[PDB]
Design a protein around this nucleic acid. Structure first.
Lengths: 120, 259, 56, 255
RNA sequence: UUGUUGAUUUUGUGGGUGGUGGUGCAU
């Protein structure tokens, strides 16, 4: 189980319990409130100022939140559920998500332990 | 208890709401959603005595400002009760226009509406008149296919009651793109009234509303069920088919292609 | 329409330190993270609609 | 009777003034409460209270996302009986037949008449081609029999629903296609008459579908070709006239 | 897109619907 394939069921499970903050605005609100447990960030954001900020908020001394780096924003939007499902089997009309933050996990899975072990 | 000055102020607010018909609401009433104890503040405004105009604007004010979880309480505790109270006490058992528009406004938030108005109603002795009035609102207002599919799936899991069958008919009449998970559940619903071991639903008498809903499903999703599901539904008609609707339903099922 | 309005509310220093450039609404319904709109004469909340003086 | 009417009018007026007085009292109360908002809000603010989902509610959130993952079905309509379709089809034939008969008698649709017209007359990936050359730009390298395929693909790639303005692009394409049909006829085709026949009729069939939705655009181009050919007849006479002109008058009758 | 909010809307193309409609009739 790769880390990327681990993050697949992660962002899907968190969706089922409405525990995902989707968008730059929602992600930052979660981080400032301390409601964030995990941060997933896109390396390919055109504006570096977004990258500097989520990193800064995630690395705040009072509330240190783990951060994850992902190549493309389009695929995170698919993981955050933004995209729509077609007759064939592939995702379509997917809306790229620059930042996604996990508020509530919902269920305890084995995929947790690897990610938390990886950060530790 | 709220501050006695606050109680007097909101007491005067409520008196305005009794006779309010048009214009600007009292500014104190406007900021109630932004309060943690809006329930306590709302109680002193006497929600039962709100004029129908206040109920319409109150639904606009609170559904937009309150969270989804909080809007469910507002819909469930006030709007649902007012919708029931007006129908029960009215001479013709009709619903006031302003309340009729309020229920549409609450439907702007599907999750809160479904869990606050529809599901509590059908599970709390909904009557045919209530279902007809509520069903009409659901018919006209645009509702998401996803939210409706979840709502239709749940109603297909509840015990049979004609008031619930109406809402099942309305949702089917909407002509949504139901996911096949919902379609399979819909097949299961009509598969539970066939004679086989089976429950009372097998021998339970079926009103026309059940047949019309089953014709409604047949006319549309005949192209979205498997051949086995077609055979199961086809032989359901053979056991529970209606005199006049039944033959028509047979034609629609046979005209469809398996998915 | 305003683009990346959230970006403007807060700033980065070269060391990664994050500072908030707007005051946050004191209302616990708003909780934390609700930033007041800065007008010439007043601070305005978009959620609670409360009005605060700029220098209060 | 008159005294009853006056009492009714007086009673209505007496009721109207009471409503206005009540409305004014309501407005005055609203003004006072608004003035007292800040005092009420502050005391309310100080006394604010300090900071598990239902099993049914949990299921719904599980359902909603699961339904999101699942595929969605296409909706279909009720199948009309063969008699109803024939009755409908027989009806639709009737009005069209009746509409044609009235027009042979002089009914003019804008329903004016021919006589109205005779007043004052005697006293005084895939690229959409907006131009005829642009259609050829995509089709130099394609064979003669390949013209219907590219032309059909252009319509598919620019259907009205796909994007805004596709109606205009196809409407212009309708005019562009018509000139292509004329253009091919002028070109020599004795070598490959059979291949030309496979293209020439196919393009006309496509134009017929386009004309059904773009008769306005087609008619404007049709007039322009009509207008142009007098000017060529105005200088070249028969040398202006070619096979395509004979073809053109044929296509107009079709469409 | 709402009034701050988060996909609930907006836009373009097609498109089904008379229905909190009445009046009588047959337990």
């Amino acid at each position: 189980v790769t880390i990327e394939d681990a993050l697949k069921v992660v962002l899907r499970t968190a969706l089922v319990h409405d525990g995902l903050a989707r968008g730059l605005r929602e992600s930052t609100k979660a981080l400032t409130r301390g409601e964030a447990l995990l941060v997933v960030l896109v390396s390919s954001v055109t504006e570096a100022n977004i990258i500097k900020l989520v990193e800064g908020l995630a690395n705040d001394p009072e509330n240190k939140v783990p951060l994850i780096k992902v190549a493309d924003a389009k695929q995170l939007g698919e993981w955050a559920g933004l995209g729509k499902i077609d007759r064939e089997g592939n995702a379509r009309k997917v809306v790229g998500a620059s930042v996604v933050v996990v508020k509530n996990w919902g269920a305890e899975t084995d995929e947790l332990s690897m990610i938390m072990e990886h950060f530790s | 208890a709220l501050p006695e000055k606050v109680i007097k102020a909101y007491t005067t607010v409520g008196s305005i709401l009794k006779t309010w018909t048009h214009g600007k609401l009292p500014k104190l009433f406007k900021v109630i959603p932004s309060l943690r104890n809006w329930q306590d503040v709302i109680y002193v405004t006497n929600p039962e005595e709100w004029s129908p105009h206040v109920v319409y604007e109150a639904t606009k004010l609170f559904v937009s400002n309150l969270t989804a979880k909080e809007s469910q309480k507002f819909i469930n505790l006030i709007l649902l009760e007012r919708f029931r109270d007006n129908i029960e006490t009215s001479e013709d058992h009709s619903l006031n226009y302003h309340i009729y528009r309020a229920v549409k406004k609450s439907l702007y938030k599907p999750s809160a509406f479904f869990k606050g108005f529809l599901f509590p109603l059908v599970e709390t002795g909904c009557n045919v008149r209530e279902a007809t009035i509520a069903g009409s609102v659901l018919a006209k207002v645009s509702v998401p296919a996803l939210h409706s599919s979840a709502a239709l799936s749940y109603l297909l899991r509840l015990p049979f009651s004609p008031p619930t069958t109406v809402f099942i008919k309305i949702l089917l009449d909407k002509k949504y793109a139901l996911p096949y998970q919902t379609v399979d559940d819909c097949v299961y619903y009509f598969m539970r009234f066939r004679i086989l071991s089976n429950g009372e639903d097998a021998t339970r008498v079926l009103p026309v509303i059940w047949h019309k809903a089953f014709l409604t499903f047949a006319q549309r999703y005949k192209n979205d069920i498997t051949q086995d599901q077609r055979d199961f539904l086809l032989e359901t008609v053979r056991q529970r088919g209606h005199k006049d609707i039944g033959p028509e339903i047979r034609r629609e099922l046979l005209a469809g292609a398996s998915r | 329409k305003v683009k990346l309005a959230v970006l403007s509310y807060y700033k980065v220093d070269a060391e990664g330190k994050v500072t908030k450039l707007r005051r946050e609404c004191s209302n616990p319904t708003c909780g934390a993270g609700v930033f007041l709109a800065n007008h010439k004469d007043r601070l305005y909340c978009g959620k609670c609609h409360s009005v605060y003086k700029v220098n209060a | 009777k008159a005294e009853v009417m006056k009492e009714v009018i007086a009673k209505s007026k007496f009721y109207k003034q009471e409503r206005q007085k009540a409305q004014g009292i309501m407005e005055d109360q609203i003004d006072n409460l608004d003035d007292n908002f800040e005092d009420v809000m502050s005391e309310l603010m100080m006394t604010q209270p300090k900071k598990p989902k239902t099993d049914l509610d949990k299921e719904y959130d599980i359902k909603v996302k699961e339904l999101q993952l699942d595929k969605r079905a296409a909706p279909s309509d009720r199948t009309k009986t063969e008699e109803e379709k024939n009755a409908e089809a027989e009806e639709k034939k009737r009005e069209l037949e009746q509409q044609r008969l009235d027009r042979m008698n002089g009914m003019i649709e804008l329903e004016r008449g021919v006589e109205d017209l005779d007043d004052g007359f005697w006293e005084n990936s895939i690229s959409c081609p907006r131009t005829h050359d642009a259609l050829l730009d995509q089709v130099k390298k394609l064979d003669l029999d390949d013209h219907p395929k590219i032309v059909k693909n252009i319509i598919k790639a620019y259907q009205p629903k796909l994007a805004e303005g596709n109606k205009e692009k196809l409407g212009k394409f309708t005019a562009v296609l018509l000139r292509h049909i004329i253009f091919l006829s002028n070109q020599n085709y004795l070598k490959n008459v059979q291949s030309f026949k496979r293209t020439q009729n196919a393009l006309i069939s496509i134009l017929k579908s386009l004309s059904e939705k773009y008769n306005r655009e087609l008619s404007e181009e049709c007039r322009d070709y009509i207008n142009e050919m007098q000017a060529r007849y105005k200088k070249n006479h028969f040398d202006a006239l070619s096979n395509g002109d004979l073809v053109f008058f044929s296509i107009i009758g079709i469409l």
